Amino acid sequence: NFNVAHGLAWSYYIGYLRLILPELQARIRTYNQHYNNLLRGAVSQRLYILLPLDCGVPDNLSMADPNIRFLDKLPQQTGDRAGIKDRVYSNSIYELLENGQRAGTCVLEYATPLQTLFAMSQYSQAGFSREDRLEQAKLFCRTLEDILADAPESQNNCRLIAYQEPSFSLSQEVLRHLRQE
Amino acid sequence: NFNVAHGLAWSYYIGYLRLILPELQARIRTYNQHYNNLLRGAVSQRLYILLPLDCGVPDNLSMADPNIRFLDKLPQQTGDRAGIKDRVYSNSIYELLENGQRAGTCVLEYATPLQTLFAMSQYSQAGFSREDRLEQAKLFCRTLEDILADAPESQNNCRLIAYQEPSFSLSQEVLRHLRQE
Ligand SMILES: Nc1nc2c(ncn2[C@@H]2O[C@@H]3CO[P@@](=O)(S)O[C@H]4C[C@H](Nc5ccncn5)C[C@@H]4CO[P@@](=O)(S)O[C@@H]2[C@@H]3O)c(=O)[nH]1
Structure with missing residues (x-):
């Protein structure tokens, strides 16, 4: 059944990781500066x-x-x-x-x-x-x-x-x- | 590569269709009654x-x-x-x-x-x-x-x-x- 995991890995990348990873550091910046508790550790x-x-x-x-x-x-x-x-x-x-x-x-x-x-x-x-x-x-x-x-x-x-x-x-x-x- | 489509079909069902289909008629009811334009066709x-x-x-x-x-x-x-x-x-x-x-x-x-x-x-x-x-x-x-x-x-x-x-x-x-x- 080799092809099952292969396809789900490619799907996870194509359908999610390649879409959200480019914008992730920007999203974490935004949270750290504008929404994170003043007194807590950066995400x-x-x-x-x-x-x-x-x-x-x-x-x-x-x-x-x-x-x-x-x-x-x-x-x-x-x-x-x-x-x-x-x-x-x-x-x-x-x-x-x-x-x-x-x-x-x-x-x-x-x-x-x-x-x-x-x-x-x-x-x-x-x-x-x-x-x-x-x-x-x-x-x-x-x-x-x-x-x-x-x-x-x-x-x-x-x-x-x-x-x-x-x-x-x-x-x-x-x-x-x-x-x- | 039989297993590629097989896995994506099972994933689409398990990960989406089995989760959203049970609550879909209720969601369409809600839209038709409360948000649909008075003068337009039901969804x-x-x-x-x-x-x-x-x-x-x-x-x-x-x-x-x-x-x-x-x-x-x-x-x-x-x-x-x-x-x-x-x-x-x-x-x-x-x-x-x-x-x-x-x-x-x-x-x-x-x-x-x-x-x-x-x-x-x-x-x-x-x-x-x-x-x-x-x-x-x-x-x-x-x-x-x-x-x-x-x-x-x-x-x-x-x-x-x-x-x-x-x-x-x-x-x-x-x-x-x-x-x-
Ligand atoms: N049309 C439609 N299909 C959907 C939707 N949600 C899931 N599916 C589909 O259901 C199957 C299994 O879902 P799963 O969660 S195990 O895997 C996803 C997980 C990850 N995506 C995300 C998205 C948001 N947050 C976290 N992860 C990549 C992977 C493939 O995502 P896809 O979009 S390419 O397609 C999947 C797949 O075939 C939806 O809202 N609409």
């Missing part, structure tokens, strides 16, 4: 993209880790897309708690296509086993990192976080990446 | 989905046909999705002109995944020829009509319009479907 640059290989994508991040808490939204990006006037691209800023205190602030979300690889394995008519799914989850991440390696839109404004669950802390996995910068 | 039920097999998806429908004109937006649907608080699902209402007069009003848009099959054929690193693309465009449409055939969310609130360009009128192709109901 970090770069979109943090969670890639659970078990494809467990909760809709609420706080369900993954209590130490990951919704703070605010960036200014919305809108554009005409395929006959939709003002299609909305929205992103969410999280606080990452270390010892019940804020250790960092970033734009953070899951790669939605993985929620879709999950659903596809659950639907009989899709013909996609749960074995197929760990494999295609890996291929999706690889394909996406190859694409971004050559992408002119990734000018260091995007960070992939791939991880496997065997006590594992997501907030710690994000802070580990966030602190490399 | 038709059902989401009209354009499926050009040449995968030519302009962002503005008026570029496909001057007789297809943006009228208004439905009320926005929002929900937490994969760590995005209040991700926005937006749809656009078009007037279909026959003889410079309104012959019909419907929620109308292109299947975005086809814009993506187009882009994929244009990018060297995707490894996807323009021959592959007409084939995968056909498979996408088939896979999608099989999915919807069994879908509990498609309770006759969704209409696929597949078409090939060889004078062809899109507004006439939409009015032909719209008038079957």
Whole structure:
């Protein structure tokens, strides 16, 4: 089933990352200056993209880790897309708690296509086993990192976080990446 | 490359159609009663989905046909999705002109995944020829009509319009479907 992950990786890039990454640093500037709390840390640059290989994508991040808490939204990006006037691209800023205190602030979300690889394995008519799914989850991440390696839109404004669950802390996995910068 | 279209069809269903179709008749009710012009035709039920097999998806429908004109937006649907608080699902209402007069009003848009099959054929690193693309465009449409055939969310609130360009009128192709109901 090689082609499934390949197509979803190209779709994620073409349909989302190449569209929102060019305007992301500008949107974070705007938030930092005009909407961020005077007394709090600037939102970090770069979109943090969670890639659970078990494809467990909760809709609420706080369900993954209590130490990951919704703070605010960036200014919305809108554009005409395929006959939709003002299609909305929205992103969410999280606080990452270390010892019940804020250790960092970033734009953070899951790669939605993985929620879709999950659903596809659950639907009989899709013909996609749960074995197929760990494999295609890996291929999706690889394909996406190859694409971004050559992408002119990734000018260091995007960070992939791939991880496997065997006590594992997501907030710690994000802070580990966030602190490399 | 069978698996490319298959995955994008399942993604379109899981990631969009199964989420927005259940709440679509309610959203059209609301528009008809509270926002539609007193003196104009009700917006038709059902989401009209354009499926050009040449995968030519302009962002503005008026570029496909001057007789297809943006009228208004439905009320926005929002929900937490994969760590995005209040991700926005937006749809656009078009007037279909026959003889410079309104012959019909419907929620109308292109299947975005086809814009993506187009882009994929244009990018060297995707490894996807323009021959592959007409084939995968056909498979996408088939896979999608099989999915919807069994879908509990498609309770006759969704209409696929597949078409090939060889004078062809899109507004006439939409009015032909719209008038079957
Ligand atoms: N027509 C129409 N189709 C839609 C819409 N929303 C989703 N889909 C389609 O549903 C399938 C799976 O959706 P998913 O969330 S898993 O994947 C998306 C995720 C990412 N896009 C975004 C956008 C905003 N915020 C965050 N990410 C790229 C990827 C492909 O996005 P596309 O636009 S190219 O098409 C998808 C795909 O086929 C919509 O509003 N209109």
